[PDB]
Design a protein around this ligand. Structure first.
Ligand code: ADP
Ligand code: ADP
Ligand code: AIR
Ligand code: AIR
Ligand code: MG
Ligand code: MG
Ligand code: NA
Lengths: 381, 376
């Protein structure tokens, strides 16, 4: 009815899985495109999934020929197959938004036309040290070396501190299209989850995030020690970046806070984002519930995106050992107020996002205290 | 690891479903024994499930054979069948405790040995008019005609006896002395290998004999009554062997004293609010309890006032859809549909839990949904 439609999700990792939990609560059929038995398929026992990859032309097209709206839980999808099937199903958010967004360098130039403040950069026309060395004397060291495509979870980033790191950097991001970014000296990082609807623009509070080795680690929601003046500029900034893109759906906005208190965009995501996991226990409508509603033109009471109590989300990243992530979840079993989410991801690879723990509390202070020991254990591994 | 043990659950209705939701978060495998595509199995795509009824000796024996522990999501389960296998698989909570509980008369007699304040009652051996009549004289009217095993009949005076008896024909009974409560109460208790914990006392509301609404916590009920209820609950449940979540329904008497209504040996309707209401739901709590995992006390506390509205089948096989479609627009409304599909009259189709910082506030948001459901 309002829930008879089928939703095609390109990608079926943890994100796709949180989306399915939300789908399941409303009895909306979610057909997933990804490997068999992926995280999302694991909790949706029916026959509509499609086996194959989201960057796969014919797999992308089959999914679409069987669903009323096709969405994505990842950006590195075949937007060409999507333009091809644009006539057979609705796509939200838009294939052009995804195509743009999926190339970081391209995303950025798209936004610069829009006024968006963002770190200086230089594309790398070949992958020579000569080239890099050059760009180095153009924007200084260190600098962030980055792959234009396929990057997520710090996977296409490489900090270059000196000209002596050059070969390692290049090796590291071997055979990928690159660009370098002038350093961003942030006093903190922020993120706003924006929701684009048929007739409205909604958003959650600004949160403070902490990244290490280029990967998100913690999220404090709402953001600590930030004036309502900053929260605000942050929010405007985020809505602006989003308005630059076509589509209904949840959008993730990453910004850096300058020592000067001014704001910079770090990157924009045309999907459900790690920065918003706290919404599950943190608000009445999680980002995941929100996103389905948006792409299905279902209501979204704004009150439901307000934060119920303070919270902190800690990621459970693969460590040196492959058992290691379990030890963290295990410790979480004893943190008061800690909600544990394991991704059913398989082999835990170092740096691999394997699950998250979200801790709430009537006050940050107290949420901070409940979680310390778990960060402590997490830290020593 | 700590989450490599297998859980087999008898039943795959909305209860097993939420129980499955919780294990999927922990990636703990659940083999459900029930029909195919049961609400629960649909959210658990693996091959360990068993197709059958939890009333058939063999379906059951098959499930134990593939689990570490066996638990249940419905009370009417075969406990002799379960008994048989307590040799091959651990059963939590006890088949004995289950067996005792699923008979309300026996459940009742075990609990008097323990001091559980309850209604006086009288066992009907004959299901004869003359026998009932006598009882009535000791107990007074009206009184509650009850089956030990929809199964109740309020009897007002001598004359209703007749109607009252066919009314509960086939079944054996005992009648209960009237309870003049001013409110109904419920406590979700958690029996751990080591302790008996409870979540807060909540107020429950019925309609046509089916839970309709629950107010968490119970409205304008002093802190003392709350704790008294919690105490009584914990104490009755401690009279049982085995681990796991137990739901205890109580009567608040006019004099503010508490009387036990009944105990259910499992995750129970009155506790659904614990999903959005507490850091650890009753589903989360059960899985931990049975598997011996920590259960931090604070995680059992109510984060904010919440109200759960059950979504009950009406006359139309779609109506639940109205309720939920109306709820899409209710502020702070967390919707739970059971994928039971086919709406029949009075069937439990889903539930909605609405939260807010204050109970008054939640009542305000949910009102219209109530009217809605009421309109139909
Ligand atoms: N210019 C930069 N200067 C300093 N640190 C950066 C810069 N760009 C990225 N980072 C750091 O790495 C994190 C992840 O980088 P990002 O560009 O967001 O890639 P990913 O797609 O893999 O998220 C950022 O949150 C920030 O900590
Ligand atoms: N002794 C009693 N006097 C008044 N009402 C009673 C009595 N016993 C049961 N009831 C009412 O009947 C409803 C169902 O009774 P209960 O013993 O819980 O039966 P069931 O297991 O069938 O729900 C109760 O929740 C309460 O309203
Ligand atoms: N982190 C991220 C960025 N873009 C998508 N994801 C999530 O990460 C997945 C899987 O990452 P992994 O490479 O560890 O399997 C995606 O499908 C989605 O759920
Ligand atoms: N109503 C109830 C009573 N005891 C448990 N349940 C739940 O009801 C389900 C089945 O309800 P139905 O008869 O409508 O199919 C059971 O599996 C369990 O979840
Ligand atoms: Mg990022
Ligand atoms: Mg009852
Ligand atoms: Na950092």
């Amino acid at each position: 009815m309002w829930n008879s439609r089928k939703v095609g999700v390109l990608g079926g990792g943890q994100l796709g899985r949180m989306l399915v939990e939300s789908a399941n609560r409303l009895n909306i059929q979610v057909n997933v495109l990804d490997a068999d038995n992926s995280p999302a398929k694991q909790i949706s026992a029916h026959d509509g999934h499609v086996t194959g990859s989201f960057k796969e032309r014919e797999a992308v097209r089959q999914l679409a020929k069987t669903c009323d709206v096709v969405t994505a839980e990842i950006e590195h999808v075949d937007t060409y197959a999507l333009e091809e099937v644009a006539s057979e199903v609705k796509i939200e958010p838009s294939w052009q938004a995804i195509r743009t967004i999926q190339n970081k360098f391209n995303q950025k130039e798209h936004l610069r036309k829009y006024g968006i403040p963002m770190a200086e950069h230089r594309e790398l026309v070949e992958n020579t040290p000569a080239e890099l060395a050059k760009v180095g004397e153009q924007l200084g060291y260190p600098l962030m070396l980055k792959s234009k495509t396929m990057a997520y979870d710090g996977r296409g980033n490489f900090r270059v501190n000196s000209q002596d790191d050059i070969p390692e950097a290049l090796e590291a991001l071997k055979d990928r299209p690159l660009y370098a970014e002038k350093w961003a000296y942030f006093k903190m990082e922020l993120a706003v989850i924006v929701v684009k609807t048929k007739d409205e623009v909604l958003s959650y509070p600004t949160v403070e995030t902490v990244q290490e080795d280029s990967i998100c680690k913690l999220v404090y929601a709402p953001a600590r020690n930030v004036s309502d003046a900053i929260n605000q500029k942050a929010q405007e900034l985020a809505r602006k970046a989003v308005a630059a893109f076509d589509g209904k759906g949840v959008f993730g906005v990453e910004m850096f806070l300058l020592e000067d208190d001014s704001i910079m965009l770090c990157e924009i995501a045309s999907r459900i984002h790690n920065s918003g996991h706290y919404t599950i226990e943190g608000c009445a409508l999680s980002q995941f519930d929100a996103h389905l509603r948006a792409i299905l033109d279902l209501p979204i009471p704004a009150q439901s995106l307000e934060i119920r109590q303070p919270s902190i989300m800690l990621n459970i990243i693969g460590g040196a050992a492959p058992d290691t992530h379990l030890q963290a979840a295990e410790c979480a079993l004893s943190i008061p107020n800690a909600s544990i989410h394991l991704y059913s991801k398989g082999a835990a690879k170092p740096g691999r996002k394997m699950g998250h723990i979200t801790v709430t509390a009537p006050t940050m202070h107290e949420a901070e205290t409940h979680i310390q020991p778990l960060i402590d254990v997490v830290d020593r591994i």
